[PDB]
Design a protein around this motif. Structure first.
Motif, mmCIF file in Angstrom:
data_model
loop_
_atom_site.group_PDB
_atom_site.id
_atom_site.type_symbol
_atom_site.label_atom_id
_atom_site.label_comp_id
_atom_site.label_asym_id
_atom_site.label_seq_id
_atom_site.Cartn_x
_atom_site.Cartn_y
_atom_site.Cartn_z
ATOM 1 N N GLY A 6 78.480 21.527 41.525
ATOM 2 C CA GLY A 6 78.561 22.591 40.557
ATOM 3 C C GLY A 6 79.988 23.114 40.530
ATOM 4 O O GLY A 6 80.512 23.487 39.484
ATOM 5 N N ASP A 7 80.625 23.092 41.696
ATOM 6 C CA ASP A 7 82.009 23.528 41.818
ATOM 7 C C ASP A 7 82.926 22.392 41.397
ATOM 8 O O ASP A 7 84.034 22.614 40.907
ATOM 9 C CB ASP A 7 82.315 23.939 43.259
ATOM 10 N N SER A 8 82.435 21.171 41.565
ATOM 11 C CA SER A 8 83.187 19.991 41.175
ATOM 12 C C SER A 8 83.205 19.899 39.659
ATOM 13 O O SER A 8 84.200 19.499 39.054
ATOM 14 C CB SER A 8 82.563 18.731 41.783
ATOM 15 N N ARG A 9 82.095 20.307 39.059
ATOM 16 C CA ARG A 9 81.966 20.316 37.617
ATOM 17 C C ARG A 9 82.876 21.385 37.049
ATOM 18 O O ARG A 9 83.502 21.208 36.003
ATOM 19 C CB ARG A 9 80.510 20.564 37.203
ATOM 20 N N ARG A 10 82.962 22.484 37.775
ATOM 21 C CA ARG A 10 83.829 23.587 37.378
ATOM 22 C C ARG A 10 85.282 23.189 37.579
ATOM 23 O O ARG A 10 86.165 23.578 36.819
ATOM 24 C CB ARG A 10 83.500 24.866 38.152
ATOM 25 N N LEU A 11 85.513 22.386 38.604
ATOM 26 C CA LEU A 11 86.849 21.892 38.888
ATOM 27 C C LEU A 11 87.176 20.778 37.903
ATOM 28 O O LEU A 11 88.337 20.556 37.559
ATOM 29 C CB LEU A 11 86.934 21.369 40.332
ATOM 30 N N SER A 12 86.136 20.080 37.446
ATOM 31 C CA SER A 12 86.336 18.998 36.496
ATOM 32 C C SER A 12 86.875 19.558 35.192
ATOM 33 O O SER A 12 87.855 19.050 34.643
ATOM 34 C CB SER A 12 85.022 18.262 36.235
ATOM 35 N N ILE A 13 86.239 20.618 34.696
ATOM 36 C CA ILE A 13 86.685 21.225 33.457
ATOM 37 C C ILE A 13 87.998 21.987 33.653
ATOM 38 O O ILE A 13 88.765 22.141 32.710
ATOM 39 C CB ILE A 13 85.623 22.166 32.882
ATOM 40 N N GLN A 14 88.250 22.465 34.872
ATOM 41 C CA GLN A 14 89.454 23.197 35.174
ATOM 42 C C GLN A 14 90.668 22.298 34.973
ATOM 43 O O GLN A 14 91.674 22.705 34.404
ATOM 44 C CB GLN A 14 89.395 23.668 36.623
ATOM 45 N N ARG A 15 90.534 21.054 35.419
ATOM 46 C CA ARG A 15 91.586 20.062 35.271
ATOM 47 C C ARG A 15 91.706 19.665 33.814
ATOM 48 O O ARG A 15 92.808 19.497 33.289
ATOM 49 C CB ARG A 15 91.280 18.829 36.129
ATOM 50 N N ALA A 16 90.562 19.553 33.150
ATOM 51 C CA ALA A 16 90.562 19.215 31.743
ATOM 52 C C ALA A 16 91.131 20.391 30.988
ATOM 53 O O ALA A 16 91.921 20.225 30.065
ATOM 54 C CB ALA A 16 89.145 18.913 31.254
ATOM 55 N N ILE A 17 90.738 21.584 31.422
ATOM 56 C CA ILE A 17 91.220 22.814 30.827
ATOM 57 C C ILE A 17 92.714 22.919 31.055
ATOM 58 O O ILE A 17 93.473 23.191 30.134
ATOM 59 C CB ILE A 17 90.492 23.998 31.491
ATOM 60 N N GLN A 18 93.142 22.684 32.289
ATOM 61 C CA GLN A 18 94.560 22.763 32.584
ATOM 62 C C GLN A 18 95.344 21.905 31.599
ATOM 63 O O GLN A 18 96.432 22.285 31.177
ATOM 64 C CB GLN A 18 94.844 22.333 34.033
#
Lengths: 90, 39
Positions: A6-18
């Motif tokens: 769930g945090d990896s998914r949040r980190l996944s979009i964070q990188r995509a977001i970045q």
């Protein structure tokens, strides 16, 4: 200790977001972040297609949703971000 | 439910979870068709 997929998914979009936020804000064109050039390729392509911009593409469907989360938290109409304008300006 | 347990929420992160789709689900050779001073 909460860390999880769930945090990896949040980190996944964070990188995509970045890259999405940066690539969608840093319209340099010569961006030195391979992630940006590839994201521009995605954004630059996203608009290139009108059917895709409607969510036609899983890329737009997913990006629109990703954009939904960001455009929501961002109570300010950034401006360069196409979707934000489509959701916050409209 | 088969044994692995709920997979829809349990997706083994590969680091390119999202990325994967971004550039690999491109409907066709990305289009750069620049738009006239719209912003």
């Amino acid at each position: 200790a909460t860390q999880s997929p769930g945090d990896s998914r949040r980190l996944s979009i964070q990188r995509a977001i970045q890259s999405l936020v940066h690539a969608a804000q840093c319209r340099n064109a010569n961006c030195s972040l391979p992630s940006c050039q590839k994201m521009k390729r995605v954004v630059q392509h996203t608009k290139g297609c009108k059917r895709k911009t409607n969510g036609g593409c899983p890329i737009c469907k997913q990006l629109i949703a990703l954009a939904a989360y960001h455009a929501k938290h961002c109570q300010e109409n950034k401006c360069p971000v196409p979707f934000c304008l489509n959701i916050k300006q409209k | 439910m088969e044994e692995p347990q709920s997979d829809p929420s349990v997706e083994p992160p590969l680091s390119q979870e999202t990325f994967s789709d971004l550039w690999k689900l491109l409907p066709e050779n990305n289009v750069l068709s620049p738009l006239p001073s719209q912003a």
